[PDB]
Design a protein around this ligand. Structure first.
Ligand SMILES: OC[C@H]1O[C@@H](O[C@H]2[C@H](O)[C@H](O)[C@H](O)O[C@@H]2CO)[C@@H](O)[C@@H](O)[C@@H]1O
Length: 402
């Protein structure tokens, strides 16, 4: 076709299918535009444990990057913008009524006086629990823990061992969305300061150490190697048919609202609750990170106007409401969110209450966020694996982040 537009999206499965379907329908109905949709994990943008690198930044350097990317968060935009790896959208957007977007979602697109993306979906973090497993412990299946202390107590009651072998875990702090850049906010702290500089060491961020020591209390109590053997093969930090909650192997898990989708599709018999994350010592009641997916146009995009035209088409209120319902996300346009069919879904109503009544926090906007995340991620893993003390792991992380 006249315009061949390459799109990168960041996950396979149902979410991937939804994006592929959007691209396919647009292409079918537009004789002069074809969209080649390609799944590259984390859009090649997400922080990885590898040697820095990154498939997106590599593609930008190589000179033929995708014309459009869909990334799964709001944490990467400042760094990509500062590097000049994505183009400003201000002229494309000047005559677009951006008041239609949720304020917080659109505000995250702003960096150094320019606009560098558009919100594709809005996400929040919640607690999932297995009601059948609660009943087996003599816990009220309709009442989740309100504090981390309560969570820890319930978790012990919900852990099963047979002849020394773990058969069921009550809770594993670091799986699902229990990642450092989420849990920091739950504990009322951050990975960076007001200037965007890393605050990872115990002497720079005592509360971060508190969080890590709490996580490691699980490693010490249940056994680090035991936990790792128990969850071997399972999807540790993404919603899948084989994530530990869907498999019924962990009784409670912190995840995104989207997790409802995986639960329903892959384990229809799974009897689960959805509710607020329990309050941490030093954190606010019912904490939740509000973020979302982000469209960006890479530096090197051959077809920025056509990319923008496709985005606009995906943003049709009914269309995006339908997309949001399909993937169990919150539509990023206020009008669309209000008409979503999931407004009448029992699980999603709990999600909307979190969005409306929870103590909402946001990822800080920092150009070095992703490298700071990598340093924090490595430290948390090292401590969980007992390769370092939590204290030394975080000291090491500070040096790496700097
Ligand atoms: O799993 C589909 C949802 O993915 C979300 O992004 C996740 C990503 O899958 C992974 O788990 C990573 O560790 O965290 C991301 C959130 O920060 C969102 O893209 C959501 O919209 C999808 O429905």
């Amino acid at each position: 076709k006249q315009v061949v537009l390459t799109l990168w999206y960041p996950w396979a499965g149902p979410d991937g299918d939804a994006v592929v379907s959007l691209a396919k329908e647009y292409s079918k109905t537009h004789p002069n535009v074809q969209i080649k949709a390609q799944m590259v994990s984390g859009a090649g943008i997400a922080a990885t444990q590898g040697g820095g690198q990154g498939k997106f930044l590599s593609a930008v350097a190589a000179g033929n990057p995708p014309d459009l990317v869909l990334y799964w968060g709001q944490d990467a935009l400042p760094g990509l913008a500062d590097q000049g790896a994505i183009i400003p959208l201000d002229d494309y957007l000047k005559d677009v009524d951006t008041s239609k977007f949720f304020e917080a979602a659109y505000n995250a697109m702003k960096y150094k006086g320019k606009i560098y993306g558009l919100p594709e979906m809005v996400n929040v973090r919640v607690l999932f629990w297995n009601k059948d497993l609660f009943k087996q412990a003599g816990l009220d299946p309709n009442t989740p823990p309100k504090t981390i202390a309560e969570l820890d107590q319930m978790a012990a009651k919900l852990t099963k061992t047979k002849n020394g072998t773990i058969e069921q875990m009550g809770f594993i702090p670091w799986i699902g969305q229990g990642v450092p850049h989420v849990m920091a906010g739950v504990f009322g702290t951050s990975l960076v300061d007001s200037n965007g500089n890393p605050i990872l060491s115990p002497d720079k961020n005592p509360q971060l150490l508190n969080l890590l020591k709490w996580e490691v209390s699980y490693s010490d109590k249940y056994g680090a190697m035991n936990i790792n053997k128990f969850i071997a093969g399972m999807s540790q930090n993404s919603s899948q048919a084989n994530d530990p909650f869907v498999l019924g192997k962990v009784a409670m898990m912190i995840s995104g609202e989207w997790q409802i989708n995986a639960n329903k599709q892959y384990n229809p018999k799974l009897n689960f609750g959805v509710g607020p994350i329990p309050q941490a010592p030093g954190g606010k009641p019912m904490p939740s990170l509000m973020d979302g997916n982000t469209w960006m146009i890479p530096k090197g995009s051959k077809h920025p106007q056509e990319a923008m035209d496709f985005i606009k088409w995906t943003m049709d209120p009914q269309r995006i409401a339908d997309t949001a319902d399909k993937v169990y996300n919150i539509a990023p346009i206020v009008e669309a969110a209000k008409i979503q069919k999931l407004n009448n879904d029992p699980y999603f109503k709990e999600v909307l209450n979190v969005a409306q009544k929870g103590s909402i926090y946001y990822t800080p906007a920092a150009k070095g966020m992703l490298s700071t995340e990598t340093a924090a991620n490595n430290a948390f893993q090292a401590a969980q694996y007992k390769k370092s003390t939590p204290e030394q792991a975080l000291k090491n992380a500070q040096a790496e982040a700097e």
